[PDB]
């Protein structure tokens, strides 16, 4: 991720990759040229090879050890250039090699924004399948949808708004708790890590409402356990806030941060003691939670128990 | 159980609209979110629609739904805010900023469908042009306070009085004394409460995507002082 | 009784000799011309001593420094003779609202385009990206010009409101500068968006641009009438047209106005005003010197039309009219280095658009 090298052997390599002279690039590999050579502006041979469209050169540099997520000075990566110039064959290999699908640049433009502006239907559906979140906003708040219309690509607009719709349905299903509906939408290409304008994902909703069955399904498909809304709240927080024991276990088993804090500074244990949950408190301690965590107002979980008149919960904590 | 109680057994969408005027500076702000009386938690996000806000966001926090407060089982009899629902209640205050102007607010808190709205009107006079308010000298954080409540049979409501502590960027403290009175709107009976108090937490935030002058809020409110 | 003239070598000095033979024919004044290079550095030193001829031949930017030291005399042409020259050409000879030299020729930038590869050139900067893609498929570039010297990049950043120093009724406001305004901030950003998107490479010089276009490696470039001769040598069929429009409004290229002043320390001033008005500024005089070396644009509004027959010069004049005249005050020394240093940093990401243009605003 990002380089800034400098060498005469590198300059020969960049020019060789730009012009697309496959062979002379290979000789420079053996002759000692640096695969990750960067020039003044941070451009690497993979950048020039991706924009030039020479798939042969791109494949070789990946094999040798080129940085797939190399970000030049302007934030562009090989995926940006490979998308701004409509090289479908190159957008597919950089993704197999683990490239950041949603890589913001200096102006916040992700690779999808580019695939939408120019209307490369091919690259779009490719980026969408590899998890490219639809509601990607840049400096000007122009999502790929808000940008596809501004340039007259109406078939892209529909395919995007048709995806943003699916995501909203995924939250509504998780909120109300319909296991079959939430399975339909995932199977239709609904990003599990889709966060509405308030930063909430279907993982929070399945945890606060107590729809256990839907939780692990989101986690199984890769739901971010440590997802935070605009208030810094984690699905683990809401599992303790409401007091749904079974979901607390699953969230921790999958790697839920126990030290998480909302925008006030409440740990999942601060909330369990608050809401008077006798058993939820013993579970978070069982997993080693900071006993004397102080929120923004310096109150331990013990204090929240007394002020609310929580006898037994307070005792349990004083012992530990 | 009474309607006021049954309405707050879970999450409730919230709307907040406000129009204000401070030394000829007229503005309007609106926010939305949700609350959960069972846990006193409020998740809101306020946006300024009238350009930029000429006053600091902390000053208006109190102005912007105390029915979302946690009343334990030992003191549900003292929960006036919920009893007034779904009919509603009118909230009026007179905020005295020490050595500066003052606010006067009128607000109606009623249900418009399933959403709970808090429509407000703000009046500000006698504020110093380079004061802490109109000069934007207040920090972007909020302290904790204890609100004191006492009945008012002769007016059928509650007489609430408290003082807020605002933090200035120079290291000083500004006081804003709140004289508050709440009277219901419906003929239905209400539960006038004995002398009790509350305890509040707050923390202000922002949103990296929203380009308009805004504010994010997270609050926790609970009653105590009686067994 | 005697009169000498200095000039540069690249221009047509031979034709000038024929014109000096007729002035000595009618009234017997000895006319002589010699052109030693580096005469711009040789004039201010010789001007103090009083030597060096009255008539000089060089750009108007250097006369701002010569007239600043009070070394050039004020001219007084006839009000009717000014009607023969374009009005905007006299803005280059007005110093502090007073004339100090005679206009000669104009030199402005114009885009070139390979007709064999692109018959219809675009008319807007905004449609070059789509055109570059169209041509990159065929293994050739769309545009490629000198980016180092800001003289070539100023036409764009100045289109949407950018200006060096505010020009009012013949005087420049040293206080006001037009490089920090949001108009130019929008121009440069579009240019950087081309380098950011690999339509052009920041490390491009005049030599690299000329070499590419002359060998068909690219389809468009930018240059003045000084390089038109080198393109015909490369056998490439080319053409000249107006510069495209950014935001819908044309480009503002710095206008170079060849000028001829009068040294303040010469003994025969009226013997030059007579020649420069009736004998030199003539359809015959300009046609002879132009035959020795193509001058490009012309101050005389008439002969400019005779040259407009050639679409090359007709297109070059349009650019000057739609462009600001290059200031001549000495403050430009702190402006070139200020901008020339800002364009590079901004076009390389080393500094943002705002950072690179506010620092350039402090220099001015």
Residue numbers in the entry:
A (entry chain A): 6 to 325
B (entry chain C): 1 to 64, 68 to 230
C (entry chain B): 5 to 368
Give sentences copied directly from the paper behind this entry:
All 9 off7_Hxx_3G124 constructs were able to bind MBP and GFP simultaneously, demonstrating the absence of steric hindrance between the two targets, consistent with the structural models. Two DD constructs yielded crystals of the ternary complex: off7:MBP_H10_3G124:GFP crystallized in space group C2 (3.1 Å resolution, 3 complexes/ asymmetric unit (a.u.)) and off7:MBP_H11_3G124:GFP in space group P21212 (3.0 Å resolution). All three components of the complexes were well-resolved in the electron density maps. The structures of off7:MBP_H10_3G124:GFP and off7:MBP_H11_3G124:GFP confirm that DD fusions are capable of crystallizing with two target proteins bound simultaneously. In the complexes, the interactions between DARPins and target proteins were found to be very similar to the interactions seen in the absence of fusion partners. This is an important observation, as this reassures that any conclusions derived from complexes of DD and DDD fusions will also be valid for individual DARPins.
In this paper, we present a strategy to fuse specific, high-affinity protein binders to obtain multivalent or multispecific scaffolds of predetermined geometry. DARPins are used as building blocks to confer the desired specificity to the construct. A series of rigid connector modules replacing the DARPin capping repeats allow to combine the individual DARPin domains in such a way that their distance and angle can be altered to test different geometries, bringing the binding partners of the DARPins into a defined spatial arrangement. The two helices are not just joined end-to-end, but instead the two domains are made to overlap in such a way that the joining helix is stabilized by contacts with the domain cores along its entire length.
